[PDB]
Symmetry: D2
Subunit: 495 residues, 4 copies
Amino acid sequence: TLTRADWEARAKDLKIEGRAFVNGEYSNAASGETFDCLSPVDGRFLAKVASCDLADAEQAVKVARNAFDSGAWSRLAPAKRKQTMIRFADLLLENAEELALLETLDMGKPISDSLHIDVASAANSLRWSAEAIDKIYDEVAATPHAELGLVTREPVGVVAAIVPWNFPLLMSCWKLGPALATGNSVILKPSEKSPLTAIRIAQLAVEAGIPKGVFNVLPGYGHTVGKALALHMDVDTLVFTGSTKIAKQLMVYAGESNMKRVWLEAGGKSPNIVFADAPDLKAAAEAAAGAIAFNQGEVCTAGSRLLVERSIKDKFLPLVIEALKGWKPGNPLDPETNVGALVDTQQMNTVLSYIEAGHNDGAKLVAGGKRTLEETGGTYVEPTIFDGVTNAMKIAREEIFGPVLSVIEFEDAEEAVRIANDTPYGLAAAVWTSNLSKAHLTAKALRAGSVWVNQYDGGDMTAPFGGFKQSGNGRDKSLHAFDKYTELKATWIKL
Amino acid sequence: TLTRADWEARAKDLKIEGRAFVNGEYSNAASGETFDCLSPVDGRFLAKVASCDLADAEQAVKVARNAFDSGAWSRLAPAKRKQTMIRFADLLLENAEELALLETLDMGKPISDSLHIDVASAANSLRWSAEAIDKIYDEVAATPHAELGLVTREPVGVVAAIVPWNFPLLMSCWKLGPALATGNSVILKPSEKSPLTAIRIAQLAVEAGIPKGVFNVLPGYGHTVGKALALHMDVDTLVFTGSTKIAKQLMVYAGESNMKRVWLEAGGKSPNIVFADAPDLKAAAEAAAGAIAFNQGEVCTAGSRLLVERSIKDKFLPLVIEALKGWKPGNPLDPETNVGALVDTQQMNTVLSYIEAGHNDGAKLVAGGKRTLEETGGTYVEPTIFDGVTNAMKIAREEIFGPVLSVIEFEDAEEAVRIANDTPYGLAAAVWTSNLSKAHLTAKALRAGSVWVNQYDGGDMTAPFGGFKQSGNGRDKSLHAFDKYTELKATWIKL
Amino acid sequence: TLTRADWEARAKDLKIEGRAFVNGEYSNAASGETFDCLSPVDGRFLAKVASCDLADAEQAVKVARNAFDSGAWSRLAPAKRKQTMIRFADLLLENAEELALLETLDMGKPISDSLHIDVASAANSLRWSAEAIDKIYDEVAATPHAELGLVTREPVGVVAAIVPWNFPLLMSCWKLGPALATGNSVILKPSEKSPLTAIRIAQLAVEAGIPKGVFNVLPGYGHTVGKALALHMDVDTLVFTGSTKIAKQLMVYAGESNMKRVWLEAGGKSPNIVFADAPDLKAAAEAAAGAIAFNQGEVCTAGSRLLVERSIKDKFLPLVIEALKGWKPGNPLDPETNVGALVDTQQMNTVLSYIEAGHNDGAKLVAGGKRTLEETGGTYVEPTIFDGVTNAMKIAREEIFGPVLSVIEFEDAEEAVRIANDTPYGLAAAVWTSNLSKAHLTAKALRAGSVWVNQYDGGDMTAPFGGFKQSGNGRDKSLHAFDKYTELKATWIKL
Amino acid sequence: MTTLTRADWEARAKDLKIEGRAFVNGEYSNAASGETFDCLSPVDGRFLAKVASCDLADAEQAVKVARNAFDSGAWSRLAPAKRKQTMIRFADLLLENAEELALLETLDMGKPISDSLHIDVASAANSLRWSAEAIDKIYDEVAATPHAELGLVTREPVGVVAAIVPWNFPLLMSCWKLGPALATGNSVILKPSEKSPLTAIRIAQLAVEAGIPKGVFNVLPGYGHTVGKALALHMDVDTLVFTGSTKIAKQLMVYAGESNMKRVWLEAGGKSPNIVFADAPDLKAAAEAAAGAIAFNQGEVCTAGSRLLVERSIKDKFLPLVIEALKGWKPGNPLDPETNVGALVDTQQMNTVLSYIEAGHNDGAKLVAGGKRTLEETGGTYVEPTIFDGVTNAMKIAREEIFGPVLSVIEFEDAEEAVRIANDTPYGLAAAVWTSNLSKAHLTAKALRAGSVWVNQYDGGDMTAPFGGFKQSGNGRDKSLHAFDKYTELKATWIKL
Ligand SMILES: [K+]
Ligand SMILES: [K+]
Ligand SMILES: [K+]
Ligand SMILES: [K+]
């Protein structure tokens, strides 16, 4: 295990690449322009990252399309693509410490979570998708004797992937895994708030055996290079994870361009329902606190709306606050630190604005609620719990994407479900009960892509992850993730 | 068995409904306004059809939402939904001749086609989807022993369906089948060029046992009621079959509204590739003629591009011309007629304008090329073949949606594949050969949702139907059609 | 609704067929020998049933083999087999009253059960299998580009089915459904204790459209005609439902002959586990009584072992005794009878022998325990409950196949599981509890093909049915039953 | 650069320390009786090691151990991802000991060292790896039930699995079974053939080193009529899987009926037809494949192309190509990497092959290649690749499995007769068709009653292809995800809500 002093030492002795990666080579943007990569830890300078635009996107697509048509990857044997992506995953573990440090410095996540959660799950996501390549079987229909009906899946071609900043490496690997496994060419557009991890792994892919031009990274802003890719006439599929606002615009961009397939993972207001007959209220309390404090509340499936039955609310709420004592906002370079820094100033101001909206809506602040650690020159906010919150208030409707918890009461099982579904979102939800019938009937009633019973943030690579309604469409992880990067073909042969 | 005089007699004594169908009852538009429905058979009047608008759509959505929330259909047992849908299918067969007569008068296709193909296939489409309901299994993931990972599917809720005019009944049932089977509430919006059969079957559904509000029909215009459904914040999913322009516009409406799931099926320029070593050149010639003449060429997967190998072009071309003679444009109410009228004047003018474009591109007219049966008062056109066509010409790249064929020569298998894939479309393709390797390798190389080998227009309800690229997304028929009306939920239960 | 007088009248005026059905025709045994088919209702004579032997098996197989090779049914289109088997199902319903009467007269079960349960389920079982034929897809493997790898299923050919007497018609259709659907020829050997219904539906099959020789019925003894089919060198597959002892002999016969596939469904000693925290204790008691009294306890999945927790046993037992009083043995031809007669004298003596064994083991007779209705000439035994039973006693370990209940108690969940799995059988089990974790963890711990939570005798045609250990191998119902009558073929094609 | 020679492999043979004890409960041990048998080599007749000769007492002890390990849940209730990771390490360990395992193979049963290393060990490792990777990719079912009801259809390990593996592919066949069986969480007792026990004895230790708990994977060397019979008759063995002859396979099925009605999955003999049409894409390639289909692994392959069905119109031009191609397959020292054809497993097998060759002459068939014992002066058992011409499908050498490099050439007039001749057999394990015609390739393939049909190639299919026979060639399938079904039970859990 590395010491805090070791991480800071390596942070100084760290050479960072900021160039784009096209056709197996690192290069600058066509304009040569660049934005500064700032660290939210202490406002330090990390590197100067290439700022791509339309010209870079046009070049990357041609390279991606040519690589796809060549067949170097798209028509490579399934078992061989599997072995290549496994080496890709293995290389992520070999360079785990650097990747973890890059991410922590990039967006502020505690170094322990960058190494043991981010990097570890990222390599697993690539490996699992690789292992699944030659385990998938296509279909043969029941036809008359003198006829053969084949139903097969083929790679779409050129795939554009726009990755957020909360889990830059992990979300990249959730997209890269199945997309590369199916044999597509990928153009990765990382978030401008965290481009370092995407830039680094692009070289690792080529070292693993991924042919030139199959995996490309175009750093920059969403309104520039991101918009260019979404509007490009030769991009077949665009996958995205982020806000509902941006996701809506990307779908419009598709309707204005080439009718490209769009698969979106928007935001969410995931309810965490706690009944009176919960097996362990303490465990549920620790979970409810962790569901809003982990990754500084910067999680799409954060347990923002904590629903508690009136029978236990007076006992349960003190346990949540007591459990939240352990989630300290500290130095992201310290392994012992539970909660790190927010991504940037704008994010903090937004979170603090919602905290301000919390008071103005008439909510009773019972924990935190203020900016912390300003002396570091960093961006930090302490975990926050608002009591007496109804589902009509602003802080209950809108997604804060910060460590702010709304506690809501319900009378019975019917109301809890009514409140939980009272949202345009539907990414996740949780149920805490020891009753067999109620657990299942509630989970079925909830309109969410992921329902966790007697736990929060469950499910591994075998669990399809996505949302209902405005939380997005399509699924990441599992075998269902492959469907987003493939086209069905019905080959009917007359014998 | 019925003669020409029989169908013309029934057409004069036919009482046609023109109202919308909302919540189990027929009703005029909220504005009371209507539009005239004319017959392209001879320009006769049929009935006044309700012209719905935003208000009507607003009412139907709440009706559909309430029906879905009640659970009268959405939470009915799968086996019971099966029985009802089968009863629905049977009712189409009992009213087969009326539905066939309505279809023929509405949009012009021959009566024998309406009865023996359209009505039969539509009923089969409903029955097949019904039979499939309780045969589909969801998933249980491989999890640790102290955990249960359920992966299930649930109906999306309210489903809007915009249906084309070329196959009004059949395309409606391709949507209605899987949409109703999954337990969703459906709001059908038929084409203004052919609203009758959609209006009629709405009554048959409730007679079969479909609860009120589950299946609603709103006739009208795309920019009014269609636009309203596409922009409604409470519509979960939109399905569509039509033009690329409209399909692209619908996707924008979703991005502007509630980010609703959109499944589109656009046009196509399907290449019909005939090699020298085809098993039977005569049979391929018959299929080549039929691939452009059937349903007046108003077919999405019409063989509008006949790709012939150069070494057999001089022998195969006359065979196609001779075979095309068998398809005579005539009185659609005559059982012997195999080529009916075009849907309306504007469609005829579009076809005629493309024939003019054929001459101006330098192509050699070798069959048809003129408007026919003008004295009847209906819009008709001769099946048309152009020779000496290159894939760069206007008639070879743009969809005509008429019986206009483009004959293009190729040298070898590599050129054929290149010419075939050189199109923004990708809905269907066909290969004619007796060689094992060449048949399979070509079929794999074609970018089309359906590849027919040694036959044309193949595949039944077991064959998924849809497009690559700008021919659309998602699949009709097969079990895959059900996935367009369901949402995946990952329920991970801690034990 | 027919009355007791109606059924008794139809019984006396019923003409019964007792010949075998080979190659589409009724005919006597080759030796001309017959056996007397008597009714357990009152000992009356019903018909002289053909007593087939080796020579009849040899002829039937040749007929079945020729029918399979002709491809009239085996190579008929999947959708055509579906439509025919659906007509088969309809013919069972059109002859429901006749079939129900035969069943009741043949083996003694209540007329209401034969009609509203047995016939209705038999027809549904056939219908469900038929609907499933063209819903099943075979597989295409993930192979290198220059290769096509198909994984398909083909009918085995000649299938021999030996069915029991407890559910003569239903068990027949459980085999017939998937066997005929997949295209096989079937030779059905009904139990000599209940041959009538099998003989009847054979004619119904050919009326529906089943080709001659595809479905044959050979009535007779197990040691004569059953042994001949099991030893026949041209029978591809043998399916069976009955006792463990007979199932073992058949597996030996196969090993001595042509190594034919053997799928067995032997006996069971199903534990019905009732926890203290069951949702409805009244419903649990009502179900427990029905689990041993329904069909005269002649059910392989009968709850012959009732497991009650100590903290509720003294309160739960009188509820079971009271519930059992509703199940009164009586005239099977009376619509209001819920408990009929045992199949014959041998079965009655066997059941009575185990009741005496219960006394010998030291158990306490707390309900029933005697033969009844001896004056009628039939064989009846009243529902019997033994209390104070340990899992070492004879009546707890050996299958009785009568309405005899053994009540065993346990301290905790661990002991319940240990006692439940302490048996050479593993066909079914039930768990009654309201706790989420306890329900699932117990169900996963029980070694039974079927596990019913908070209910008994659950699962429709979607649920596979079979046993662990000595309860047999393979599954009936669901889509898994199809695999017992098909062979896998891997066709690897080099392109 | 470096290159292993014949002398290098021979020197490795004299250095090699060979383990011969049984492996029960994570430890090596003798048989309870202490009896052993002499493991000899068909390479030159040399002594290899004294291998434990187990019996009833050892089978009883191994089952109890296997049962206890299963019930403990140390492996059976371990997470799928963790079972996956353990078996990958197991697969990696086979690769890290590839040279030793391959040498053990060659010395034991006589196949060429280049085959043992590049084919057997490599495939066996990949088979374990593939089955491991597939563990958490498989999904159980949820049925379409009424709303207030939940219907789960799940799979669970059977418990104790006895595996009886043949001698022709000792390591590979072992891993075809061990892969899916251990992946599903079962305890396995492996009984290797008495003609080749060494590799099974070896890998047992490697499983333990990889993380497989004690008693989960046991190895009992000995005879089939003793310990093999004991496992088949045991009342606590849940499942018996087997690959070998039709006669023994039938016998095991009897033992199951006589004991506890244990599930029995078998892969018996075969007489696979290799069908070559006039319109074959490449006659030269088909001729090379035909020769290889009978010479590879000394013809001791279940799916060997023992029947060559040739269309009459090309018989006179196809046969000389096959005879020429057969010359490339020369019997030689198995320890020489250049050798492509090794030795037969023992003297008994050699005599049987020689007996069938004599029967070929007696049936009236014409000898056109090989037909004699060779390399007799080496002290080893070798037989030349043999081709008989003018064979009918009624002759003894055409209907009976030879399990040696003896090919039967049979003529047919057309596709209809070809299918008839090809199906005229009690077996149905494999078949091949060579044609360039689309319709004829598919229709013939569909008409052939065989578990594996290869078109325009021979011995095709990787781990994604199910492998097993029709009729008397056995039941069930090895490889693919279908293999897992032989080691699991279906459970329908219907929960009323
Ligand atoms: K940054
Ligand atoms: K019209
Ligand atoms: K009887
Ligand atoms: K040996």
